[PDB]
Subunit: 75 residues, 2 copies
């Protein structure tokens, strides 16, 4: 997928643990600490639901069919 990060912004690619590999890729891309932010995705109700495990990222792989995974990050 093409991940579109959002700081509450980035565009990188992901080739599919995949979770921390994605979280560390964001942590290393954005210079400002690992374990100091919280990843999120947008559900069908419009809320921002946090995910931090392989179990949850798969459910996020469901809730994005816009060809681009959008992640909103609180620090």
């Amino acid at each position: 997928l093409t991940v579109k990060a959002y700081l509450l912004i980035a565009r990188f690619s992901f080739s599919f643990g995949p979770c921390e590999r994605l979280l560390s890729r964001v942590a290393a891309l954005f210079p400002a600490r690992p374990g100091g932010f919280q990843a999120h995705y947008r559900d069908e109700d419009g809320d921002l639901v946090a995910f931090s495990s392989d179990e949850e990222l798969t459910m996020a792989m469901s809730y994005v069919k816009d060809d681009i995974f959008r992640i909103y990050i609180k620090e």
Copy 2:
């Protein structure tokens, strides 16, 4: 089969988490909740669900949960101990 566990903080939500669900039922459900939320520890929270009229009603037994699931998404509301 899809639990959307709200984390109450400040009557309002703080951290929303969603996961699939199907070793009792209530224990497994509480086990997944204490493992998905970093702020939560086992035995240090209270799971709820909305009644037909909207009131938050707490549960902690498999006998409650099977009846509590009578209402395609199961929404749980968690209060910290």
